[PDB]
Ligand SMILES: [Ca+2]
Ligand SMILES: [Ca+2]
Ligand SMILES: [Cl-]
C-alpha cells in the first residue's frame with residue numbers, strides 16, 4: 001500500500017492496482033489454485049478478510065479486492081442515478097478487473113455490500129462464476145419488501161444514507177470517527193469492537209475519515225434504495241433465479257436474519273443454494289473466522 | 303431575536319413539569335396554538351394576529367421547546383410523549399383559568415393536540431390539526447417509499463447518543479435543510495428571516511436537540527402504542543375538528559388525509575391548501591381564513 005502508517009494484514013500476499021474503464025481496483029493477491037475473488041462491504045475495506053484469506057490461500061488463488069470507490073480503489077464520479085455505485089456497475093467493473101488477471105470464470109465470495117455485488121454479478125453474468133457465496137445478506141429487494149415500523153427502527157441506515165446529498169455527508173462529516181466506530185461495534189454479536197483487530201479498525205477508520213470515501217458510501221446506499229432495488233425487482237418479478245451453485249452464510253445475530261429465514265429467502269432467488277447460520281453478528285469473517293474459512297473452503301473445493 | 307407578535311404579551315406559565323412560555327394576545331374565547339419541529343411558537347406569527355381579532359390567543363412553546371423548560375426525560379421518553387405534553391399544557395391552561403378552549407396544532411403540536419382530544423375531550427370546544435395524520439397511521443404506512451420520505455422518524459428515534467452526536471456537527475445546516483426541504487419552494491424563502499433565526503438559535507442548543515430526539519423516540523414507541531390502543535378500541539375524537547394540509551406536504555404523501563381523519567374523528571372537515579408542510583408560514587392568509595371561519599362557528 002501507499003499509506004505509510006497502515007498495517008499489512010496479509011503477510012506474504014502481493015498486490016495489484018488493476019485498471020478498468022471505471023478506475024483502478026486495488027487488491028491483495030495470494031495463494032495458488034482455482035481463482036477466488038473476495039469482496040468486502042460497509043463500512044470496511046478488503047482488510048476485513050485478513051483472518052480468512054490466508055487459510056483460503058492454502059487452497060485457492062485469492063484476490064482480495066477493494067470495491068469500486070472503497071479503500072484504495074479509485075472513486076469514479078457519480079451521476080444522478082448513482083450509476084458507478086450500483087451493484088450492476090460494480091459487478092461489471094470487477095469482471096473487467098478479473099479479466100486483466102486472466103480470470104474469466106472464477107469463484108466469488110462477498111460480504112455485505114460486496115455480497116450484493118456478487119449476487120447481482122450472478123444474475124447479470126452467471127457465466128463468469130463457478131460458484132458463489134453470499135455472507136450476511138438477503139437481496140436488497142427483500143430488505144425493502146420487509147419494511148415496516150419495526151424494521152425501519154431496527155435497521156435505520158438504509159433510509160438515512162440514501163437521503164439526497166449533501167444531507168448524510170454533512171451529518172457524517174462532523175465526527176466521522178464516532179460514527180464508523182459505533183457502527184462497527186453495534187453490528188457485532190457483543191456490541192463492542194472486541195471482534196476486530198485494532199489494526200483493521202484503523203484501516204476502516206482512515207477510509208471513513210476521507211469525505212470522498214464517505215460520499216461513495218452514501219452513493220452505494222442511494223443505489224441500494226433506487227437502481228439496485230429496481231434491478232432486483234425486475235428479477236424477482238420475472239422469476240429469474242441464479243443458476244450458479246450458491247452458499248448463503250449469515251450471523252445468527254446479524255441483519256439478514258432480523259425478520260427472515262435466510263435460506264428460504266435465498267431459495268426464491270437461486271436454484272442450487274445451501275446455507276447455514278454461524279453464531280456471530282454481521283461481520284462473519286472477523287467474528288467467526290475459522291468457521292467462515294472452513295465453510296468457504298469446503299463449499300468451493302467441493 | 304425579533305418580536306413578531308404585535309399586540310401580544312409574554313407569559314411564563316408554571317406547571318408541575320416546568321414553565322411553559324407563551325405569547326398571549328386578544329380577547330374573547332380562548333385559543334391555544336401549538337407549533338412543531340424544528341420550530342417554536344414563532345411559527346404562528348403570520349396567523350396569530352388575525353386570530354386575535356376574535357379570540358384570546360395563547361401561542362405556547364411545547365414542553366422542552368423554545369423557551370419552555372426542559373423536564374428530565376426517562377427511559378420511556380415520558381415527558382415528551384404526546385400524552386404527557388398534553389397533560390402539562392392542560393395544567394398550563396388551568397393556570398390561566400382555561401378549562402375549555404379551542405386548540406390548533408401544527409406538526410408535533412398537532413400530535414399533542416389530537417392526543418389531548420382523545421385523552422381529555424372535555425377540555426376542547428374545537429380542534430384544528432395542520433399538516434399531520436395520526437402517528438399510528440404514519441407507522442402503518444412505513445414501507446420503502448415512506449421510509450425514504452420520512453427517514454427522520456426512524457433516524458431521530460435511534461437510541462441516544464447517535465442522532466445527538468450527528469446533529470451537533472453542523473446544527474444550523476440540518477435545521478435549515480429541514481425547514482427548506484419541507485416547503486413547496488425547497489428553500490428558505492417562505493419564512494421570515496427573523497423567524498428562521500428563532501428556529502436556528504433553538505436548534506443550536508444541544509439540550510434542545512436532545513428534547514427533539516426524545517420527542518421522536520416517543521413518537522416511535524409510547525405515542526404509537528397509545529394510538530394503537532385507541533384504534534383497537536375504535537375510539538374517535540368527538541370534538542368538532544378541522545384538518546388542513548399542504549397539497550405538497552407529508553400528510554398527503556402516502557394517504558388521503560380526510561379519509562384518514564374520518565377514521566379517528568366523528569365530526570371532521572378539512573381541505574388541502576397549496577403549500578408545503580409549513581401552512582401557517584407558506585400560506586398564511588388561507589390558513590388564517592380557514593381557522594377563523596372554523597373557530598368562530
Ligand atoms: Ca492446491
Ligand atoms: Ca397525495
Ligand atoms: Cl451499469
Ligand SMILES: [Cl-]
Nearest residue numbers: 137138143256
Ligand atoms: Cl439484508
Ligand SMILES: [Cl-]
Nearest residue numbers: 288289290291
Ligand atoms: Cl470461528
Ligand SMILES: [Cl-]
Nearest residue numbers: 338409410434
Ligand atoms: Cl410530525
